[PDB]
């Protein structure tokens, strides 16, 4: 029930990634659609007709029946090739989005895993605080019923106890919600999860900022998709100028049609003009066409494409600045986490001394049990904060590496050494 | 004047809900234009033409004229029926989003209503604090004048007085802004509103979570949207496959023509071939075709449709998970509110006791008037907390009913029974 | 260096505003595309064909070789003019959004400047705090060595000293992040920024509320875009109606061809029908159309336009009420800022008095030096708070200027007169 076992199932259960995979497959398969028009196309054309002339052509009756096939093959029209180029670039963009989604899945699973354990720690602290506050109430009540204290003190103690009970209920609810959050990502209810092995924690140091900047510029996902968009805009510009290009097609058709002639006027002195015929047709030919003026429409589409391209370039520059600032922020965040870890470590070192000193006084008889319980609660506070700091450090390490774009699953030794014995998630 | 009346006015004065209704009307009307391509499509034409083509015929004049009608009526094609069905599904989707907008309107009205009472309470207690701090400053300045304290202590009192003045100004501004934001929903200014009846407030217990989950599965609007979208994807898959089947059409026409010539040379021994004519015809017939080979166009559409279908399935799974999570979170917020109510009740009792002790002590002469003012302020704030807790409980009950998918004016009515005390929205 | 220079550079460097300008330009270019169809058209259709008779119809052959130009020009169609009107409306919309973008840029530049200044002040305050805590730790350690306290006191002192070390590190990280986030807008590194001079700080009272609302309802941007949107919806209603109106167009052309034949079986009983011929055609004429019984294809298209228009009218009402609430809220915010500034000045004076008292006591020998350092820290905290309040006041005045719809660069020119003294961002 460590992070690796939870993420392996999350990979094959998460619908957010599955939708991304479906989108990528739709984008890829669509290319075959755009290559279809270039190939030849066949069709059938049977039909029927009936006519009845009037006005001058009075008393003329006729009926017709025909059926034929068609086949058109485009010889030279680059309009269809530019569609293929644009569609392959679209496929590239979709694949980049898929990579981004994969990294997101990893990060979200890790975050939920740590949130559960944080909830458990705060719950333990709240239980200790409740016990201390209850002992205080018992002491005050006994004093009052023997004297030495007014009723207002009793009511104040009751208020504090009710407040700690409310906090305990809130903590239980939060522990359930986080588990429910862990079931919403992975898709399974986990009763037991491993925790941090405190005795083997690593406060590593990060690389210089400039090296991270270079790696980011080289292999970041956002700016890569932005570059794909810029290339797509250039290709669209190339597609705009395709209008002036002439086009030609090669079409061939064949079919039969047997038409007979009748009528009182037709019969008699026909002269061979109205005799029936049973010829066929095997037409084959070409076709060529080219626009001359077109009122400058294409000369306007060309400028629209150029403006779109410059807009895309500005977008790319914005994305570049964004990635730079993000990498700097992540580096600073890691350093801040290191410093906070040191501070909390010293803080817990100090609180241990006081809880140790309160215990000895009770052993000899200078203090009371209430002091010991209060010191225990404070130390539990020093314990819950330190664990939170450690988890934040780990998540920030993952965050910087994700900004580099270089993490999919190489966080195998990163967390394997950070695991320990199972800890229950919903004790009863 | 009160909650029910405000909701009644907003039900017909709110522009967002009316825009939703307009969208519903647009969706339903769309069914008409999907039907239209089934009925006959009558038409009219009329065209004149002059021609002197003389590659070999120089001096020949031949004008032309025509005017005819048209009728077309499709017999067999499933490209139109699929469109009808898909438009019907879109209409259903629009209806569901309209219902969601209704529930959103109810929630927004309730929240805006309760914020005003919160502001009133805050304002009253801030004024009490201002009075207490002013009395403190008066005492300190008198004491400094008499020669018992240093100038440094006067500055502290003046600073505290200025701080409370600023807090009171902020409270008044927040009350004004909360009044304005409620007008942004109804379009009216409310001088007074009804307040909660403390002695007629109920504390119920929520139903078991399993029954809530069952009801949510039955009647959750987002899940209805998801299922309808998936059905719309399946029907679209059926539509794509129907691009294979053939089509049948029927056409008819009738018109006239003149095609009159002129010229002395044409007349005379023309053989009757070049004479003017006034022919007319009433041709009618059918038209049939069946595709044979279209390339990947036929093939690719089906695969793309199936990919979209699996995407819709993933989206539906996401909807299911989200619904379950939201139901549980609301169910737990309810109990959290109950516990907080208990705690704040105890706090109010404690503050009452402290105030009474202070008042008796001042009556017998053991305390100054300044001490009494502070206890009154502490009690007054304790009613800020308890008031803001009950409103949270009511809002949370409204939310949980919304998630269950059964939030109607009937549910909102049950709250108004506890609001039976008018109060001004602008003291003095 | 100064605010004016920073804005001057950001105006001509920022990529988002340049993208807005590019989008405006590309939108004004669509007007040309709208008119183009009205102007004439010209094309070519040269081609070739080869027939063949079979099934008892062999021996008959033909050869087609065609070439002809075509001119088409529409003389009456109201649908095209609707497109031009719609395009003009789109151009207006683009201009409006460009103006909004400029105003947003001004706001962001001012915000970044003041954020950097606030970071500098906070860094100074935290440095003073660190000095004070270090001296306190030294005192406690010396006392323990001399034998007046226990180890727990030293542990607490070390914890307190460790905490300030984390806070100092975080302040530098925030300062660097602010510098980078300013570079993201401007595009340059700024070692120094002009600082606020307190000798000439303005706290002018603002104008009444109703006057501001009336002026805003005239030259605001969001409601102007809403009005243009409703107008284009009406222009969209007009476009729909013109689908059932007749139209005319003109056609012209010319072409030649050669139609010689060859073959052995063709000879025999030709009867002049199998003779080679060359011919041309120069048809020119007008045309007309008018639809009837279309199954209400465009009839039901009109109802969709009207519902859309009422939706647009509803959105405009929403925009109106939103502007109302926004301007009122901004006014209240200005007033709150004034009050807060007064409070912070009083606090600063009180802290100064306390520091003077503490310093005099130390000079006469009744106080240690830890007290002096603590007083200094409190004074620096007060100074930081006051500076933040002043910056927020300036930002709020700019914000209300923006909400009014009258924000430019000359308005910001006045604020430059409040910034005199350069201050280093990262002093050595």
From Swiss-Prot, chains A, B, C:
Topology versus the membrane: Multi-pass membrane protein
Compositionally biased intervals (Polar residues): 250-265
Domain of life from the UniProt record: Bacteria
Region (Disordered): 248-276
Gene Ontology CC terms: cell outer membrane; efflux pump complex; MacAB-TolC complex; membrane; outer membrane-bounded periplasmic space; periplasmic side of plasma membrane
Disruption phenotype: Cannot grow on efflux substrates novobiocin or fusidic acid.
Keyword field contains Repeat: yes
A Pfam family of this chain: OEP
Activity regulation note: In vitro, inhibited by hexaamminecobalt(3+).
Keyword set includes Repeat: yes
Sequence repeats: 1-208, 209-424
Sample GO molecular function, one term: identical protein binding
Transmembrane annotation, as ranges: 41-52, 61-74, 247-257, 279-289
Topology feature Extracellular, residues: 53-60, 258-278
Effect ascribed to mutating residue 374 to A: Decreases inhibition by hexaamminecobalt(3+)
Location(s) in or outside the cell: Cell outer membrane
One example of a Gene Ontology biological process annotation: monoatomic ion transmembrane transport
Subunit details: Homotrimer. Part of tripartite efflux systems, which are composed of an inner membrane transporter, a periplasmic membrane fusion protein, and an outer membrane component, TolC. The complexes form a large protein conduit and can translocate molecules across both the inner and outer membranes. TolC interacts with the membrane fusion proteins AcrA, EmrA and MacA.
Homology family: Belongs to the outer membrane factor (OMF) (TC 1.B.17) family.
Biological function: Outer membrane channel, which is required for the function of several efflux systems such as AcrAB-TolC, AcrEF-TolC, EmrAB-TolC and MacAB-TolC. These systems are involved in export of antibiotics and other toxic compounds from the cell. TolC is also involved in import of colicin E1 into the cells.
Domain remark in the UniProt entry: Forms a continuous, solvent-accessible conduit: a 'channel-tunnel' over 140 Angstroms long that spans both the outer membrane and periplasmic space. The periplasmic or proximal end of the tunnel is sealed by sets of coiled helices.
This protein's name: Outer membrane protein TolC
Species, as recorded: Escherichia coli (strain K12)
Organism classification: Bacteria, Pseudomonadati, Pseudomonadota, Gammaproteobacteria, Enterobacterales
